[PDB]
Amino acid sequence: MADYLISGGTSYVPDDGLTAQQLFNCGDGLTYNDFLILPGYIDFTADQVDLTSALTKKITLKTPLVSSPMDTVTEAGMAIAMALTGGIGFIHHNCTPEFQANEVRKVKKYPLASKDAKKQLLCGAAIGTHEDDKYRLDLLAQAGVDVVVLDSSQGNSIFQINMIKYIKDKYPNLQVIGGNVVTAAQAKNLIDAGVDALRVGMGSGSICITQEVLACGRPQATAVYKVSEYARRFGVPVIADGGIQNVGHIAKALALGASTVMMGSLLAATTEAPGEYFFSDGIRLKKYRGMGSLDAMIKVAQGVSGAVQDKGSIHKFVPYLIAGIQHSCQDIGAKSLTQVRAMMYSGELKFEKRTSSAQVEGGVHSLHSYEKRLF
Amino acid sequence: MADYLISGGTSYVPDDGLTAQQLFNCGDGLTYNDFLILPGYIDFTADQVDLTSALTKKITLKTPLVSSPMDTVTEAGMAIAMALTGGIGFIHHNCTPEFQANEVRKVKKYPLASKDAKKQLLCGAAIGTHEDDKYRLDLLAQAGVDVVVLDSSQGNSIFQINMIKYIKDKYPNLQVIGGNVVTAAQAKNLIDAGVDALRVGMGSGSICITQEVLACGRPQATAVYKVSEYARRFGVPVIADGGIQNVGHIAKALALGASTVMMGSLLAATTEAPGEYFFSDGIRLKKYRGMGSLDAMIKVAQGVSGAVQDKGSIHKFVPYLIAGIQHSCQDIGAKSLTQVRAMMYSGELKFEKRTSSAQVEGGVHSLHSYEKRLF
Amino acid sequence: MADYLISGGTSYVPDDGLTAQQLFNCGDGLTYNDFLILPGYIDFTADQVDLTSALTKKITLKTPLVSSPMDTVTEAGMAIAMALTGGIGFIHHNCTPEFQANEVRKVKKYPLASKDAKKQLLCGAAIGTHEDDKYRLDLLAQAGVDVVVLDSSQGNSIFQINMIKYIKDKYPNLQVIGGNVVTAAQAKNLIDAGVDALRVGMGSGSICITQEVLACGRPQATAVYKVSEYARRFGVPVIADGGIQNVGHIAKALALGASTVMMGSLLAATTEAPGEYFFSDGIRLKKYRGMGSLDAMIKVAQGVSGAVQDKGSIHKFVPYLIAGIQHSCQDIGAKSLTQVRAMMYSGELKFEKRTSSAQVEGGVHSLHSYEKRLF
Amino acid sequence: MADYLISGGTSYVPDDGLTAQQLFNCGDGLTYNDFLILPGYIDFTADQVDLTSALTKKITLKTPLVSSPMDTVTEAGMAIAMALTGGIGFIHHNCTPEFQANEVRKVKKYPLASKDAKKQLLCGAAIGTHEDDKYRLDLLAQAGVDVVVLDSSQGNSIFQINMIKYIKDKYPNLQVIGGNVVTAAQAKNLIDAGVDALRVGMGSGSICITQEVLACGRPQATAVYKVSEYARRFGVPVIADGGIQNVGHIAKALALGASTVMMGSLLAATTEAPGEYFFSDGIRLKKYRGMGSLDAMIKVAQGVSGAVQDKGSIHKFVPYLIAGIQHSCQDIGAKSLTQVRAMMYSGELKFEKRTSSAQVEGGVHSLHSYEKRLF
Ligand SMILES: NC(=O)c1ccc[n+]([C@@H]2O[C@H](COP(=O)([O-])OP(=O)(O)OC[C@H]3O[C@@H](n4cnc5c(N)ncnc54)[C@H](O)[C@@H]3O)[C@@H](O)[C@H]2O)c1
Ligand SMILES: NC(=O)c1ccc[n+]([C@@H]2O[C@H](COP(=O)([O-])OP(=O)(O)OC[C@H]3O[C@@H](n4cnc5c(N)ncnc54)[C@H](O)[C@@H]3O)[C@@H](O)[C@H]2O)c1
Ligand SMILES: NC(=O)c1ccc[n+]([C@@H]2O[C@H](COP(=O)([O-])OP(=O)(O)OC[C@H]3O[C@@H](n4cnc5c(N)ncnc54)[C@H](O)[C@@H]3O)[C@@H](O)[C@H]2O)c1
Ligand SMILES: NC(=O)c1ccc[n+]([C@@H]2O[C@H](COP(=O)([O-])OP(=O)(O)OC[C@H]3O[C@@H](n4cnc5c(N)ncnc54)[C@H](O)[C@@H]3O)[C@@H](O)[C@H]2O)c1
Ligand SMILES: O=c1[nH]cnc2c1ncn2[C@@H]1O[C@H](COP(=O)(O)O)[C@@H](O)[C@H]1O
Ligand SMILES: O=c1[nH]cnc2c1ncn2[C@@H]1O[C@H](COP(=O)(O)O)[C@@H](O)[C@H]1O
Ligand SMILES: O=c1[nH]cnc2c1ncn2[C@@H]1O[C@H](COP(=O)(O)O)[C@@H](O)[C@H]1O
Ligand SMILES: O=c1[nH]cnc2c1ncn2[C@@H]1O[C@H](COP(=O)(O)O)[C@@H](O)[C@H]1O
């Protein structure tokens, strides 16, 4: 019959909205708040959405959530909690090598939990690009680390490329994550060096002043899309880092091509985060600082020291983030994050820009007073 | 003579401004505050403007105003007042089925008043898409409801399409309104299911945080235009829902293709609205909350609970909205809302964008102090 | 009901094709063969199409056809035949003033026939812009001429403007046609001088070499549209002159805003045209030359002398042109030429460009041999 | 009064057509036949147009016409005739140095005639860029040459720049013309070398096959405009060379920014041109060949050898070219070539493109047979 012979199973489907390709080809510098994802078709419940994601070329997680390698975010307690919730944590390196190795050992000696072949909790750690980081690399490797991230603001350098090749020659079994990068040109040199994943973001962090101090960086949404589009051609996953304020930001970063999301301030002031609580203005809060702030390190500061208010425990906050990601996937019409990215690259997923008035209308407005309770 | 033979009765009419088609084809996400309607020609007084409008394919109202189905906006008293003023009200469903049926019966047992063939006040009600909403549908039908709205944030789903077909097979006399939708693709599935009208808006409500929590939605002006343009091809009217803050917003929604306008916060803190008044900061106010807030309903909140200040009675506020709609129609040069939409689709009505500086100049500015009294 | 209240009587009407405004705003130089008129809706027979048209501000004709003022096209016999068929003829001026006055007197003393208040056939004549043309103007005025055309290749000059004001001061009853012009800038000076119509075309004539000799002119379709759009603002009709090869060209010139069409070679080699027939190559033909050729007049030639083959009598050829114009109007969906121009300016009439391959496909192609017979 | 105070003496002047800047910024490669010049306003007779033009920074001619330095175009007889008519001729160099010096001396020993301070006829000559051209330069300088052209297909070279500096150091009184160039980048190096004029054109000659053989060159109209726009910034005049087939081409080259026009085939087969006449096909003709053809000079030919038909004497042909240039200036509305270029750069002069159908309509068409006589 003609109902099938004209075009097999493909209904008319009216054209409305922009594809990611034409949204990010306007040359404008877009942030997460500058656009939205148009709704699709629903034929499943939100509990049937799969959040399985690739951290690297051969490391798979149950959820796309990762903890940032900072001295006010990730130590053994945070790493254990993130591994148990189905994600992972990267331990910071501004301590001594012996201390970081002991923290990794505490994580390895401990339903959706991320584990290895030996049934131990997965753990990651950060290192620098100086010659003394090779002794630190050896201690982290003997402690049983599974994945390592080369931590830098600008990762397209001779020092990082030399470090990547040294690790690949000495430890062929270790997964190496390069970064930070914000352009396809920077991503090419690191993929050719032999990295297993990429870290994306420059100046987008809540405690980062790099864009005002050094005049270098890029808006986070366009950087994630551009780097992910290039890295997809070689099977290399992208970690979206910096600028996440709510679960809607996480859903946007994943829909633009990222495979996992790394967060700082969102996980700051939680029970498992390093440092103790203190009171001010009648409310509880905890310290949060940038690794490039003068406190954390002739010297030019690229970060600030501050505080965020109490958030509870990650064993109660991560399941809320999971439920929000699944509800966002159900609204757009995809049964998994893999399907979301597949329909994004095929042009089936649609987007729309927002003006300043559109953002004002989208947020809470025109009320005398209100309470904003998330869960 | 040549004054008529060159072009019959069509004067030169200088070309200035943009048509709705070219305003909403720029791909930008426009809100009501982002544009204006250019003035036309006046040959009648504002008292001669007709506001007759279609709620559905076969339900007509004297005015285009509707009350939102919320537990802080519409119960029997609000529905009676809106029906008497020439509009209609949709009773909320977060109560028990027996209670909602009794509230509809109060409205049915009570110059521009919206009435049926039996001369009783018109009344509407909302239902969900779960299998137990069928017993609620039966009680609402026996109570004498005239029109029913399937209440959901994203209405392009298997559950809503199944519910629409069940209602059409069982109650061929009942009018069914689908929604919420913001794209022509979503509107097509519901029009093919057999709906009688569409509800448009997603994340534009004053108490809505859906765009920030789930990253899904669309700016209200472009969504209303795009859905109305598609729904006009099948004789299906559009109800504009969310983001109405003043009578200028109502006039813009009607001029972009909507046939009726739904409002929750504009009618909140009125005498007929549910809940009692209370004092704070030396002024009177009433509670107003989103149906997706934690108070109104593992759980992800999509709304907030708050309060708005006193507004008086709708028997004095609705005639003010009517007078403002008529004055706006006289300024643009149309004798009825039907004529406004006809000249909008023909390209005769013209529009212009506003920059941020244009919005600042358009509002009250450069005064030490002032009093803004509407009526 | 909603079928009328959404938009009164205006059906959806799918958008396809370009309006004249957007076709002639591309900046490209378009000729009649570069575009087509898209078909419309038919609710009448071709015999019900009215071809009434304005020659000037107060002279109306039954058909839009006019004879060019050339010594191989228009004398008393051609003027009588065009007047009897419902059009008009302009007598050439390269003869002596006494001869042209006698030729006008023959026309004045001779169903759709174009006549004056005294029931005599309407007649027109051409003059130059030199001081001796004032004595010629007086003889033509005493002979009873009704309309006069100032014949020049470039009519935006001090000499033509002085002549127009002299005629208006001396003969307030005489109609004056200015030209030739191809731009709105040239048209403004002549409309402000006080002309009653405009003549449009420069270098588009079949016997014209002005574009190759003087590098000045414009493609005929864009020139007619641009001049007619400006002249419409003052109630001044436009005569389309030069480049007409078939009835499809006549229909295009009228649809682009012209009120009448002037033709040379199309009416050449007819029985009523001046000069006798002669044989060559076994077929009959008649001489046709440009007024700027060396034969018709230190000296720079802007025209050529040649010949075209026999065409029969105009009493048999004009009714064929009338039937073709009416069939073209029926195909596009208009009951009169006035309606055609009214729907062209309103944007309801639609157009499409043609590539070189499109013109090859549109003409007769892929045959070994054929006979092309018009009527 | 308001008629002067609103905008002093500046009338409305409707905007229609393109400026040269926006015509040549489309990126398309345009030839003289691809566009036209729109008509302006006439307040003078064609006999009042001044054709005075600058050949170099300090050599002025009565007419803008120059003879090309070819062995079938310019020798003493042609140079004397062009000097007497108000232009100049450049003697070819494919002969011996002694012969070229004797031809220059014949010209120097002989109303609008181009002369020097000593009242002798102006004369020019061509040379190459090899070391042997320095002895030739000395002989030409002693013979009394006034201006010299460095003859090459591509003049942006180290050999030509060295030759220009040698001539400026040795003969500060001699005028030096560089070329050929078609881009502003090439023009900059020669203007910085110290040239007094530029020669523009590459592959546009009637006998030139450089574009098909070497794949290098540029369309002549865009090359003349682009080189003239840049050379105007330093007071350096441009000579337009190649592609001139009629007086309309001459008017276009002058209106696009050139100060003088150099022609080959247009002056070929004239009485004063070198070589004797011969008969073929029943008509008289003379040989014309490119300097890069195998006959005129391991070897790659860039020119062809052929013949063109008889043209009469230049003493009757140059006055025809002068009359045509003056008529073209009167049609566009300028009293001199200086005014034409001034209104071209100010945006007051307007242009329009031509499609292939527009060129077909602009030329002679739809005739059985005709004769095209120019004067
Ligand atoms: N946008 C961001 O992500 C961002 C920006 C700024 C800072 N930071 C944070 O601040 C910390 C510091 O960042 P960073 O980029 O300065 O780290 P880094 O180690 O790259 O900085 C040290 C500097 O020394 C140079 N250097 C590196 N290796 C070297 C070697 N082997 N020999 C000689 N010179 C060498 C580098 O050019 C670098 O600028 C990081 O831990 C990072 O988390 C982040
Ligand atoms: N933009 C908006 O208009 C908006 C957005 C969010 C919330 N709200 C308000 O909040 C309230 C809740 O909105 P909602 O969209 O969550 O309502 P809903 O009933 O659609 O939500 C329940 C969820 O369960 C699923 N579901 C629905 N029917 C089902 C069935 N038969 N079987 C299995 N699963 C089913 C749906 O996917 C839906 O997300 C509404 O009353 C609405 O007024 C409005
Ligand atoms: N595209 C065309 O329509 C076109 C082009 C060229 C020629 N022609 C035909 O050739 C004929 C000649 O055309 P034309 O434009 O040369 O006519 P014309 O009378 O304008 O030409 C005479 C020239 O003398 C000048 N002149 C005019 N009046 C003058 C006065 N009072 N004092 C001093 N100088 C004056 C004008 O500048 C004009 O160029 C026309 O009859 C026309 O039909 C037509
Ligand atoms: N578009 C044009 O105008 C064009 C194109 C091709 C040929 N022509 C004609 O053909 C003739 C030959 O043109 P041409 O450009 O080949 O002349 P030319 O003298 O530049 O050619 C000789 C070649 O030798 C090289 N050369 C030049 N001077 C040199 C030096 N001192 N030492 C070493 N090498 C040197 C150059 O690269 C050049 O390609 C010209 O007279 C010209 O009129 C014209
Ligand atoms: O000092 C700093 N300046 C700028 N960026 C930093 C600095 N320290 C850490 N970062 C980045 O900030 C991210 C955390 O950003 P957040 O989630 O917005 O709070 C980290 O993962 C790093 O990429
Ligand atoms: O909890 C919620 N979140 C988001 N939108 C909601 C929620 N509850 C109701 N809505 C919408 O908000 C509209 C009222 O918008 P308002 O008049 O601008 O305040 C209602 O008609 C619903 O479409
Ligand atoms: O010598 C001439 N050169 C250029 N155009 C001319 C000349 N003589 C007449 N014309 C124009 O040619 C038109 C006729 O063009 P045709 O209908 O294509 O044959 C006349 O009405 C004049 O506008
Ligand atoms: O052999 C050749 N090939 C290409 N161009 C040449 C050659 N010889 C001369 N030319 C150019 O041709 C111009 C003359 O072109 P014409 O006026 O179209 O015939 C000369 O002034 C040179 O710039």
3-state SS, B44-89, equals CCHHHCECCEECCCCCEECCCEEECCCCCCCCHHHHHHHHHHCCEE
CB D163 within 8 A of CB D129: yes
Q: How many CB atoms lie within 10 A of CB D375?
A: 15
Q: Is B123 left (phi over 0), alpha (psi -120 to 50) or beta?
A: beta
Interface of C with D in 145-164 (CB under 8 A): 153-154, 156-159
The b-or-e profile of B317-332 (16+ CB within 10 A means b, else e) is bbeebbebbbebbbeb
Q: Which helix (H) or strand (E) holds B351?
A: strand B351-353
Measured between alpha carbons, how far is D200 from D240 in angstroms, rounded to an integer?
5
Expressed in Å, this structure's resolution amounts to 2.1
Q: Which helix (H) or strand (E) holds A278?
A: strand A278-280
Measured between alpha carbons, how far is B227 from B204 in angstroms, rounded to an integer?
15
Q: Residue with the nearest Cα to atom 11 of ligand 8?
A: D205
Please tell me if residue B339 touches chain C, with a CB cutoff of 8 Å.
Answer: yes
Measured between alpha carbons, how far is C282 from D188 in angstroms, rounded to an integer?
64
| Pairing mode, strands A53-54 and A60-61 | antiparallel
Place of tokens 């097509």: B188
Of A248, A361, A365, the CB nearest to B215: A248
Q: Residue with the nearest Cα to atom 11 of ligand 5?
A: A205
Please tell me if residue C64 touches chain D, with a CB cutoff of 8 Å.
Answer: no
Measured between alpha carbons, how far is A294 from A291 in angstroms, rounded to an integer?
8
Say which DSSP state D312 is in: B
Nearest of C240, C219, C37 to residue D361 by alpha carbon: C219
The torsion angles phi and psi of B148, rounded to 5 degrees, stand at -130, 140
Please tell me if residue D43 touches chain C, with a CB cutoff of 8 Å.
Answer: yes
Nearest of C187, C166, C287 to residue C236 by alpha carbon: C187
Handedness of CA C329, C334, C339, C340 (dihedral sign): negative
Measured between alpha carbons, how far is C29 from B358 in angstroms, rounded to an integer?
39
Task: Decide: D and B in contact? Rule: 3+ Cβ pairs under 8 Å.
Answer: no
Contacts of D359 (CB under 8 A, 6+ apart): D33
The torsion angles phi and psi of B39, rounded to 5 degrees, stand at -70, 155
| Residue D336 tokens, joined | 């001199």
Measured between alpha carbons, how far is A14 from B191 in angstroms, rounded to an integer?
13
| Residue A190 tokens, joined | 């690191």
Q: Report DSSP letters for A194-248, one per residue.
A: T-SEEEE-SS-STTB-HHHHT-----HHHHHHHHHHHHHTTT--EEEES---SHH
Say which DSSP state B367 is in: -
Measured between alpha carbons, how far is C149 from D347 in angstroms, rounded to an integer?
32
Measured between alpha carbons, how far is B364 from B367 in angstroms, rounded to an integer?
8
Place of tokens 């003043």: B246
Question: In chain A, what is the straight-line distance between the N-terminal and C-terminal CA atoms, in Å?
Answer: 52
A210 lines ligand 5 (CB under 6 A): yes
Q: Show residues of chain D in contact with C191, CB under 8 Å.
A: none
Torsion of Cα atoms, A132 then A136 then A137 then A142, to 10°:
150
Handedness of CA C18, C19, C22, C27 (dihedral sign): positive
Nearest of C315, C346, C345, C338 to residue C53 by alpha carbon: C338
Of A36, A327, A375, the CB nearest to B217: A36
Catalytic residues of B: 208
Q: Is B184 helix (H, G, I), strand (E, B) or coil?
A: helix
The b-or-e profile of C339-353 (16+ CB within 10 A means b, else e) is bbbbbbbebbbbbee
* Interface test with chain C among B7, B225, B230, by most C beta carbons within 10 Å: B7
Please tell me if residue A335 touches chain B, with a CB cutoff of 8 Å.
Answer: no
The b-or-e profile of A173-194 (16+ CB within 10 A means b, else e) is ebbbbbbbbbeeebbbbbbebe
CB A118 within 8 A of CB A149: no
Measured between alpha carbons, how far is B102 from B139 in angstroms, rounded to an integer?
9
How was this structure obtained?
Answer: cryo-EM
Say which DSSP state A122 is in: P
CB B9 within 8 A of CB B198: no
Contacts of C263 (CB under 8 A, 6+ apart): C65, C66, C67, C68, C244
CA C88 to mean position of chain CA atoms: 11
C308 strand-pairing partners? C286
Task: Decide: C and B in contact? Rule: 3+ Cβ pairs under 8 Å.
Answer: yes
The b-or-e profile of D256-277 (16+ CB within 10 A means b, else e) is bbbbbbbbbbbbbbbbbbbbee
Measured between alpha carbons, how far is B158 from A45 in angstroms, rounded to an integer?
10
Q: Is B185 helix (H, G, I), strand (E, B) or coil?
A: helix
Measured between alpha carbons, how far is D57 from D235 in angstroms, rounded to an integer?
7
- Cβ–Cβ gap B7/C233 under 8 Å: no
| Ligand 8 geometric centre to CA of D66 (Å) | 13
Q: Which helix (H) or strand (E) holds A307?
A: strand A305-309
User: Which residue numbers of C belong to the known binding site for IMP?
Assistant: 206, 241-243, 264-265, 288-292, 302
CA distances from D82 to A83, C299, D118, D324 (A): 94, 21, 18, 17
Of B5, B6, B54, the CB nearest to C1: B54
CB C148 within 8 A of CB C136: no
| HSE value, Cβ hemisphere, 13 Å, CA-based, for A133 | 21
C150 strand-pairing partners? C127
Measured between alpha carbons, how far is B83 from B108 in angstroms, rounded to an integer?
10
SS3 sequence of chain C:
CHHHHCCCCCCCCCCCCECHHHHCCCCCCCCHHHEEECCCCCCCCHHHCECCEECCCCCEECCCEEECCCCCCCCHHHHHHHHHHCCEEEECCCCCHHHHHHHHHHHHCCCCCCECCCCCECCEEEECCCCCHHHHHHHHHHCCCCEEEECCCCCCEHHHHHHHHHHHHHCCCCEEEEEEECCHHHHHHHHHHCCCEEEECCCCCCCECHHHHCCECCCHHHHHHHHHHHHHCCCCCEEEECCCCCHHHHHHHHHCCCCEEEECCCCCCECCCCCCCEEECCEEEEEEECCCCCCCCCCCCCECEEEEECCECHHHHHHHHHHHHHHHHHHHCCCEHHHHHHHHHHCCCCEEECCHHHHHHHCCCCCCCCCCCCC
Measured between alpha carbons, how far is A326 from A334 in angstroms, rounded to an integer?
9
| Residue C162 tokens, joined | 């002085």
